[PDB]
Design a protein around this ligand. Structure first.
Ligand code: U5P
Ligand code: U5P
Ligand code: MN
Ligand code: MN
Ligand code: ZN
Ligand code: ZN
Ligand code: ZN
Ligand code: ZN
Lengths: 543, 543
């Protein structure tokens, strides 16, 4: 009998560019459309978006979109994805849509059909799908999980979550554990659950506790306080606004990215400054102990605000001895060096530096094992797909589920492109569809691929040597080096002879000019390797 | 009132390339000859060595050398340093000198005057200096701190250390806290102490505890075990050989680096294999649970042994489900991504993966705050130079000393090149000498500098377009690309129009060839920036 197909196109076996496809018959529902940020080896590129070959192929089957929350790994790919697809209904909570709308406006995309929903709303897609939204606490407001009701049963997707009893903003926001528990009693065929922190024992700390730690620290700061956190951590920022007021400090917000999230949050009633934000010039009128900066740059970006402060390149402010800088954040994996470098810059300036683990001034947005186990125990799913995690995270999430009273009948470790067939008693990967990464580099989408990146790597490691041989009047060779070594006239002449004698040997014994080009390349490679121990990229031209 | 000059040339404000200069009158004693390994922005280079300009200027004053232990950041620079200096006496413990002797023989360095010492020995350097060696436990055997006795008073240098009550090898190795306490009574004018773990609360775990943990884990492993650890962790590896024997496993050691430290340790009595090492062929004859591999690649190096295992490129062995892989190691800062990649490959293969913090299978070689506090308390120093750390470590070591019952009179945060004047009542930075880094890249020493690196970074990020224009017979342009973009005919045709017209427009008014470069190079970039939004490095050539 017809089965549900769950086809992740991004977000499985990685943390980033989340997009999941649900297909039943000839109807498709898509969930999120995130981006990913480039790793160190993906040099020069700006962002990464999902391959949507599947969706282009079946674009007439798409009934609509669900957007769980406004983080970049869930809505960042949308300008790129929507531009290639028919306009379809796109459902999300208010902050999420605010962020997407601003994003599409930057892109110049028009007539996108964004539909505001709220927790509890049940939305229908085509004839065989109904989605019901429910609240899960996360590190951004208006974050949803959903129950997807299908002819074969119910799929419960947690979205991104932690179980935070108190996010500290006085708005009574809590995860809808009652709805989750009910779904378990009703029957959950498939659980899709956030695996980010599946290797962390215990419970992720509460934002209320972080806020209390921050207030205690700041309360004891004698001078100015500079604080950095993620741009989109609206709860953390709001709580910081509240304690700043209590501690008699006015707030300056700096950094486009954070100002952008702040503006959206204020427009949707999730950010409420007790006192107006001030400019740096305005707070310059106050005493040091009355000053708090909230700004970007927690990941050590030299061009971000904290970056410019740490490197002494900020236009209007200079850090000094007696300042306190707080990193209310942790380095995203791969940013350790960048953050270490700014931290050391700060210590050399002489400012008091505050960061984890010495100070507990950050809580992750994701459930640790106790919280993951709670969702598993409440939902009691027959089948289980650990999601939003690299393989290490998915597999340890799967191991955690085995320890529980009522382990799932089968757990699968899905990969992007996997076709996961779901029936009342079916749970298997039946096949694969085209999936992967598309690089965005400046205006270019997909014009930079791995083969292009491979060159960039080689250039990066070994630098460049251009050998141009000129046959007339008498054959001579020309050497141009870029990022190879500093000028060395002796070696330059030495490289010329090696190429030349190979060029003359291709003339002493006639070969095609194309053949001789390869011959001198090989000679110069051998010499240089012996002479310098280096293997520079050599570009020979016999023209 | 002659003063002692303490001149760090490397190892202050960094972890790596330790070398410290002590000058009094016209006598110089040098301590250590370390390299540093490159960071991510120093692409393509193999290693980094100290600038020794100061020693070159003053080479006749050098009376002797002290070598505290055999780690790369204390002896790795020696082949490059000794080659430019007079052959002075070089004092060290036996394993230290065995490692140095191998290293110097590879470089062709003849007649280096290596002199073995033993703990407790007093070594005189000219009139002004007497040095006394003493034992500090570390993550390599034959590791020493020393007391340097000068006319102005006594300098105690901890060397690299932890305070490990039991390294587990049964040879009764302990730190000489008695001698250190006695130095405190005799009077310690200056204390130089290892700041590596100064931000870590508590006490670094004992190797004996790590060995017990490993044995408990390995006891439970149903099949083959693969364990990686630092090549020079002689204690850990010996402990593993003995636990392996007890658990009835035979041991294979692979990885050139590890075998190298193993051979020197064996030759100097610090490693005694209870059973002979077997080859991978030979263990292949045994049952799975009789097999233990000890190998390199703990840092994620794809070509190292664990690397090739994880990527499935090892010539003779293939990991499989049921295997257990233990990373008895932590990622050295900056290696997190490389190790994470290996770990995920291992999960995907399906092996059991054991690493910290989930399993306590690694302990640092360096003292945490409790151990640091002990040394400060025992030495009771008048002046304090926190050393072997980045500024964050140094300054946190300085704060730690302030919390203690008898804080130092003055503490300074030294930088490389600082002239620290030491008197009975003087402690200040009076001057600076030339200090810094020298890049080694293949055979070349100092032929790659920061300016060269800037280019490699540039190539790395934006790719390359070589652009050639010949005015004859009529103006035209030819293009070779590297790492810029995937082949696009429209883009390529369009770049030449900018390039050729600028040559033709440049041709209309007779122009110098160099003037053509400005129009030609300038034309493509102007266009290219509009077209792709990117700025590839361009090499203009007139044919
Ligand atoms: O806005 C965010 C927040 C978190 N993360 C990353 O996703 C994981 C979860 O972060 P958090 O939600 O726990 O802050 C972490 O690895 C973090 O680096 C992001 O990329 N962007
Ligand atoms: O390049 C290096 C080498 C060693 N360590 C330090 O060495 C300690 C582990 O002890 P050991 O086994 O490396 O001596 C760690 O705390 C680590 O900080 C570094 O940080 N960077
Ligand atoms: Mn780019
Ligand atoms: Mn190189
Ligand atoms: Zn999120
Ligand atoms: Zn997410
Ligand atoms: Zn060491
Ligand atoms: Zn060291």
């Amino acid at each position: 009998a017809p089965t549900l197909e769950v086809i992740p196109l991004g977000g499985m076996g990685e943390i980033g560019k989340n997009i999941t496809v649900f297909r039943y018959g000839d109807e498709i529902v898509v969930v999120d459309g995130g981006l990913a940020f480039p790793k160190a080896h993906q040099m020069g590129i700006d962002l990464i978006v999902p391959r949507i070959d599947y969706l282009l192929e079946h674009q007439d089957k798409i009934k609509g979109w669900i957007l769980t929350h406004g983080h970049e790994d869930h809505i960042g790919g949308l300008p790129y994805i929507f531009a290639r697809l028919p306009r379809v209904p796109v459902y999300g909570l208010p902050l999420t849509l605010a962020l997407v709308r601003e994003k599409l406006s930057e892109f110049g995309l028009q007539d996108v059909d964004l539909r505001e929903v709220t927790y509890g709303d049940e939305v229908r897609f085509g004839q065989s799908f109904v989605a019901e939204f429910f609240c899960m606490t996360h590190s951004i407001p208006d974050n949803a999980g959903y129950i997807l009701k299908t002819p074969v049963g119910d799929v419960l997707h947690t979205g991104d979550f932690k179980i935070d009893p108190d996010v500290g903003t006085g708005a009574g926001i809590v995860s809808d554990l009652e709805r989750v528990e009910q779904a378990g009693k009703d029957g959950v065929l498939l659980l899709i659950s956030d695996s980010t922190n599946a290797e962390r024992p215990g419970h992720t700390p509460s934002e209320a506790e972080i806020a209390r730690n921050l207030e205690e620290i700041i309360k004891g700061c004698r001078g100015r306080v500079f604080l950095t956190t993620f741009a989109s951590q609206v709860y953390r920022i709001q709580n910081i606004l509240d304690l700043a007021h209590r501690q008699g400090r006015r707030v300056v917000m700096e950094g486009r990215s954070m100002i952008k999230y702040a503006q959206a949050a204020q427009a949707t009633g999730h950010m409420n400054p007790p006192e107006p934000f001030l400019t740096s010039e305005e707070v310059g009128e106050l005493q040091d102990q009355q000053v708090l900066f909230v700004c970007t740059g927690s990941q050590g970006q030299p061009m971000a605000v904290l970056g410019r402060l740490a490197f002494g390149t900020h236009a209007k402010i200079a850090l000094r001895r007696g300042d306190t800088v707080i990193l209310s954040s942790n380095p995203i994996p791969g940013n350790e060096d960048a953050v270490n470098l700014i931290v050391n810059r700060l210590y050399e300036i002489g400012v008091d530096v505050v960061y984890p683990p010495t100070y507990r001034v950050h809580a992750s947005g994701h459930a640790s094992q106790e919280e993951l186990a709670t969702i598993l125990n409440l939902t009691r799913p027959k089948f289980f797909l650990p999601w939003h995690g690299e393989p290490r995270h998915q597999i340890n999430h799967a191991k955690l589920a085995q320890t529980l009273p009522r382990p799932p009948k089968r757990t699968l470790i899905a990969k992007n492109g996997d076709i996961v067939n779901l029936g009342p008693d079916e749970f298997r990967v039946s096949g694969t569809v085209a999936a992967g990464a598309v690089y965005v580099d400046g205006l270019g989408v997909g014009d930079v691929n791995d083969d292009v990146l491979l060159d960039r790597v080689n250039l990066s490691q070994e630098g460049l040597l251009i050998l141009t041989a000129v046959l007339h009047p008498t054959p001579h060779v020309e050497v141009v080096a870029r990022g190879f070594a500093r000028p060395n006239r002796d070696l330059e002449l030495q490289i010329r002879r090696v190429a030349l004698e190979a060029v003359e040997q291709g003339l002493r014994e006639k070969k095609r000019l194309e053949d001789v080009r390869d011959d001198m390349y090989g000679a110069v490679r051998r010499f240089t390797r012996k002479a310098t121990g280096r293997n520079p990229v050599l570009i020979p031209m016999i023209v």
